[PDB]
Protein backbone atom coordinates (compact mmCIF):
# COMPACT_ATOMS: atom_id res chain seq x y z
CA UNK A 1 0.00 0.00 0.00
CA UNK A 2 1.51 3.36 0.91
CA UNK A 3 3.49 3.01 4.15
CA UNK A 4 6.39 5.55 4.26
CA UNK A 5 8.26 5.30 7.48
CA UNK A 6 11.51 3.41 8.48
CA UNK A 7 12.59 -0.04 7.21
CA UNK A 8 10.94 -2.46 4.81
CA UNK A 9 7.38 -1.85 4.01
CA UNK A 10 5.22 -4.20 1.98
CA UNK A 11 1.83 -3.10 0.70
Amino acid at each position, epitope marked *: X*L*L*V*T*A*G*L*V*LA
Partner: antibody
Amino acid sequence: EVKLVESGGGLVQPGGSLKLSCATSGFTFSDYYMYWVRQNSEKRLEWVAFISNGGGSAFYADIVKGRFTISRDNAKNTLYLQMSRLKSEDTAMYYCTRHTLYDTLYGNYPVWFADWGQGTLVTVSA
Amino acid sequence: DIQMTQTTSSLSASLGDRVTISCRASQDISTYLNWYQQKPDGTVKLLIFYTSRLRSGVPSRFSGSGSGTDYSLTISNLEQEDIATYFCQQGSRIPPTFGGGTKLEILR
Protein backbone atom coordinates in the same frame (compact mmCIF):
# COMPACT_ATOMS: atom_id res chain seq x y z
CA GLU B 1 10.75 14.80 -15.68
CA VAL B 2 9.40 15.73 -12.22
CA LYS B 3 9.43 19.41 -11.19
CA LEU B 4 9.34 20.57 -7.55
CA VAL B 5 9.36 24.39 -7.42
CA GLU B 6 9.32 26.25 -4.12
CA SER B 7 8.45 29.91 -3.83
CA GLY B 8 7.67 32.18 -0.81
CA GLY B 9 11.04 33.26 0.84
CA GLY B 10 12.17 36.80 1.77
CA LEU B 11 12.79 38.72 5.02
CA VAL B 12 10.52 38.29 8.04
CA GLN B 13 10.97 39.93 11.42
CA PRO B 14 11.38 37.49 14.29
CA GLY B 15 7.88 36.62 15.54
CA GLY B 16 6.57 36.83 11.95
CA SER B 17 4.84 34.49 9.58
CA LEU B 18 5.63 33.58 5.95
CA LYS B 19 4.09 30.89 3.73
CA LEU B 20 5.99 28.77 1.27
CA SER B 21 4.53 26.87 -1.61
CA CYS B 22 5.84 24.03 -3.72
CA ALA B 23 4.39 23.60 -7.18
CA THR B 24 4.80 19.99 -8.39
CA SER B 25 4.41 18.74 -12.03
CA GLY B 26 5.11 15.70 -14.18
CA PHE B 27 3.70 13.22 -11.58
CA THR B 28 0.38 12.41 -9.89
CA PHE B 29 0.80 14.53 -6.78
CA SER B 30 -2.06 12.79 -5.00
CA ASP B 31 -0.06 9.56 -4.76
CA TYR B 32 3.10 10.94 -3.11
CA TYR B 33 4.01 11.82 0.41
CA MET B 34 5.46 15.41 0.49
CA TYR B 35 8.30 16.69 2.72
CA TRP B 36 10.12 19.90 3.72
CA VAL B 37 13.94 19.78 4.39
CA ARG B 38 16.08 22.97 5.26
CA GLN B 39 19.79 23.87 5.15
CA ASN B 40 21.43 26.59 7.00
CA SER B 41 24.52 28.74 6.38
CA GLU B 42 26.75 26.11 7.84
CA LYS B 43 25.45 23.61 5.19
CA ARG B 44 23.72 21.33 7.75
CA LEU B 45 20.54 19.65 6.35
CA GLU B 46 17.50 19.33 8.53
CA TRP B 47 14.15 17.53 8.06
CA VAL B 48 11.29 19.80 9.14
CA ALA B 49 7.89 18.11 8.38
CA PHE B 50 6.00 15.58 6.12
CA ILE B 51 2.36 15.15 5.13
CA SER B 52 0.71 12.01 3.79
CA ASN B 53 -0.70 12.11 0.22
CA GLY B 54 -4.24 12.20 1.56
CA GLY B 55 -3.68 15.24 3.89
CA GLY B 56 -4.64 13.21 6.94
CA SER B 57 -1.35 12.91 8.78
CA ALA B 58 1.28 15.57 9.09
CA PHE B 59 4.41 14.76 11.23
CA TYR B 60 6.87 17.41 12.71
CA ALA B 61 10.40 17.81 13.81
CA ASP B 62 10.31 18.90 17.50
CA ILE B 63 12.04 22.27 16.74
CA VAL B 64 9.12 23.42 14.57
CA LYS B 65 6.25 21.39 16.18
CA GLY B 66 3.59 23.91 17.20
CA ARG B 67 4.94 26.80 15.15
CA PHE B 68 4.84 25.35 11.56
CA THR B 69 1.78 23.82 9.92
CA ILE B 70 2.18 21.69 6.73
CA SER B 71 -0.68 21.34 4.20
CA ARG B 72 -1.49 20.41 0.58
CA ASP B 73 -4.06 21.24 -2.18
CA ASN B 74 -4.22 18.02 -4.06
CA ALA B 75 -6.39 19.65 -6.68
CA LYS B 76 -3.66 22.24 -7.61
CA ASN B 77 -0.50 20.15 -7.28
CA THR B 78 0.79 22.61 -4.58
CA LEU B 79 2.19 21.84 -1.06
CA TYR B 80 2.57 24.45 1.77
CA LEU B 81 4.54 25.30 4.89
CA GLN B 82 2.83 28.06 6.88
CA MET B 83 5.63 29.31 9.09
CA SER B 84 4.62 31.31 12.18
CA ARG B 85 6.49 32.36 15.32
CA LEU B 86 9.72 32.46 13.39
CA LYS B 87 12.98 32.61 15.26
CA SER B 88 16.23 33.63 13.54
CA GLU B 89 17.30 29.95 13.78
CA ASP B 90 14.74 29.30 11.14
CA THR B 91 16.86 31.17 8.60
CA ALA B 92 17.67 28.53 5.95
CA MET B 93 17.12 27.48 2.26
CA TYR B 94 13.87 25.52 2.32
CA TYR B 95 13.52 22.52 0.01
CA CYS B 96 10.53 20.26 -0.82
CA THR B 97 10.69 16.64 -1.95
CA ARG B 98 8.50 13.54 -2.67
CA HIS B 99 8.88 10.03 -1.29
CA THR B 100 9.56 6.98 -3.40
CA LEU B 101 9.03 3.36 -2.37
CA TYR B 102 11.69 1.23 -4.01
CA ASP B 103 11.42 -2.41 -4.74
CA THR B 104 13.46 -4.81 -2.68
CA LEU B 105 12.80 -8.57 -3.05
CA TYR B 106 11.26 -8.80 0.42
CA GLY B 107 9.77 -5.37 1.06
CA ASN B 108 9.81 -1.83 -0.25
CA TYR B 109 12.39 0.62 0.86
CA PRO B 110 10.97 4.02 1.69
CA VAL B 111 13.09 6.94 0.52
CA TRP B 112 11.66 10.24 1.87
CA PHE B 113 13.97 12.55 -0.15
CA ALA B 114 13.91 11.08 -3.70
CA ASP B 115 13.26 14.17 -5.74
CA TRP B 116 14.21 17.63 -4.47
CA GLY B 117 13.30 21.17 -5.85
CA GLN B 118 15.74 24.14 -6.21
CA GLY B 119 14.94 25.74 -2.78
CA THR B 120 13.75 29.15 -1.40
CA LEU B 121 15.73 31.22 1.13
CA VAL B 122 14.12 32.79 4.20
CA THR B 123 16.16 35.23 6.22
CA VAL B 124 14.54 35.97 9.62
CA SER B 125 15.75 39.39 10.94
CA ALA B 126 14.84 42.85 12.18
CA ASP C 1 18.23 11.27 17.27
CA ILE C 2 21.08 9.10 15.73
CA GLN C 3 24.24 11.10 14.96
CA MET C 4 25.88 10.75 11.66
CA THR C 5 29.53 11.57 11.43
CA GLN C 6 31.42 12.09 8.10
CA THR C 7 35.13 11.72 8.84
CA THR C 8 36.33 14.20 6.24
CA SER C 9 34.67 17.48 5.19
CA SER C 10 36.93 18.27 2.25
CA LEU C 11 39.13 15.95 0.10
CA SER C 12 40.88 16.59 -3.25
CA ALA C 13 41.78 13.88 -5.75
CA SER C 14 42.77 13.74 -9.42
CA LEU C 15 40.53 12.75 -12.36
CA GLY C 16 40.72 9.05 -12.79
CA ASP C 17 41.22 8.48 -9.02
CA ARG C 18 39.08 6.31 -6.81
CA VAL C 19 37.71 8.29 -3.89
CA THR C 20 36.00 6.79 -0.92
CA ILE C 21 33.76 9.17 1.20
CA SER C 22 33.02 7.70 4.69
CA CYS C 23 30.07 7.91 7.04
CA ARG C 24 29.62 6.53 10.57
CA ALA C 25 26.52 6.15 12.57
CA SER C 26 26.47 6.39 16.34
CA GLN C 27 24.38 3.21 16.42
CA ASP C 28 23.70 0.20 14.16
CA ILE C 29 21.52 1.53 11.31
CA SER C 30 20.80 -1.81 9.64
CA THR C 31 21.98 -0.84 6.03
CA TYR C 32 19.18 1.81 5.89
CA LEU C 33 21.57 4.52 4.66
CA ASN C 34 21.27 6.78 1.60
CA TRP C 35 23.81 9.06 -0.22
CA TYR C 36 23.00 12.49 -1.76
CA GLN C 37 24.88 14.79 -4.06
CA GLN C 38 24.49 18.54 -3.64
CA LYS C 39 26.24 20.28 -6.50
CA PRO C 40 27.79 23.84 -6.34
CA ASP C 41 24.42 25.45 -7.13
CA GLY C 42 22.20 24.01 -4.35
CA THR C 43 20.75 21.17 -6.52
CA VAL C 44 20.45 17.88 -4.64
CA LYS C 45 19.85 14.30 -6.02
CA LEU C 46 19.55 10.73 -4.55
CA LEU C 47 22.63 8.80 -5.51
CA ILE C 48 22.44 5.44 -3.57
CA PHE C 49 19.77 4.02 -1.11
CA TYR C 50 19.69 0.84 1.13
CA THR C 51 23.47 1.33 1.34
CA SER C 52 24.55 -0.49 -1.93
CA ARG C 53 21.63 0.09 -4.22
CA LEU C 54 22.11 2.69 -6.99
CA ARG C 55 19.13 4.56 -8.37
CA SER C 56 18.51 4.92 -12.08
CA GLY C 57 20.40 7.48 -14.06
CA VAL C 58 23.44 7.41 -11.71
CA PRO C 59 26.82 6.13 -12.98
CA SER C 60 28.10 2.62 -12.20
CA ARG C 61 31.11 4.46 -10.87
CA PHE C 62 29.24 5.10 -7.66
CA SER C 63 29.11 2.13 -5.40
CA GLY C 64 28.21 2.02 -1.66
CA SER C 65 28.83 -0.60 1.09
CA GLY C 66 28.45 -0.95 4.86
CA SER C 67 27.44 -2.90 7.91
CA GLY C 68 26.39 -1.69 11.26
CA THR C 69 27.64 1.81 11.79
CA ASP C 70 30.29 2.08 8.96
CA TYR C 71 29.43 3.11 5.36
CA SER C 72 31.31 4.23 2.24
CA LEU C 73 30.60 5.83 -1.08
CA THR C 74 33.35 4.91 -3.62
CA ILE C 75 33.52 6.89 -6.83
CA SER C 76 35.42 4.54 -9.09
CA ASN C 77 37.06 7.02 -11.52
CA LEU C 78 36.72 10.66 -10.79
CA GLU C 79 35.22 12.66 -13.59
CA GLN C 80 35.11 16.49 -13.75
CA GLU C 81 31.46 16.39 -13.05
CA ASP C 82 31.78 14.97 -9.54
CA ILE C 83 32.68 18.27 -7.83
CA ALA C 84 29.88 18.51 -5.31
CA THR C 85 29.28 17.88 -1.56
CA TYR C 86 28.16 14.35 -0.59
CA PHE C 87 25.83 13.63 2.35
CA CYS C 88 24.86 10.36 4.02
CA GLN C 89 21.50 10.19 5.75
CA GLN C 90 20.21 7.43 7.97
CA GLY C 91 16.70 6.20 7.61
CA SER C 92 16.72 3.74 10.58
CA ARG C 93 14.98 5.91 13.20
CA ILE C 94 12.87 9.07 13.10
CA PRO C 95 14.09 11.82 12.57
CA PRO C 96 16.18 11.22 9.40
CA THR C 97 19.51 12.77 10.32
CA PHE C 98 22.06 13.90 7.85
CA GLY C 99 25.82 13.81 8.04
CA GLY C 100 27.81 17.00 7.65
CA GLY C 101 29.07 16.56 4.10
CA THR C 102 32.29 15.93 2.37
CA LYS C 103 33.24 18.49 -0.21
CA LEU C 104 35.29 17.02 -3.00
CA GLU C 105 37.80 19.20 -4.90
CA ILE C 106 39.69 18.06 -7.99
CA LEU C 107 43.45 18.37 -7.84
CA ARG C 108 44.91 19.89 -11.07
